[PDB]
Design a protein around this ligand. Structure first.
Ligand SMILES: [Zn+2]
Length: 31
């Protein structure tokens, strides 16, 4: 069941949530 317009997570690749809501804030630093 599901009456909502939303595609699978682009970072998790699962059904239920999305990348926009997924925590996509990683530390991008050289070291
Ligand atoms: Zn995700």
């Amino acid at each position: 069941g599901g009456e909502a317009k939303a595609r699978l997570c682009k970072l998790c690749g699962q059904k239920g949530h999305d990348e926009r809501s997924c925590k996509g804030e990683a530390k991008q630093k050289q070291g």
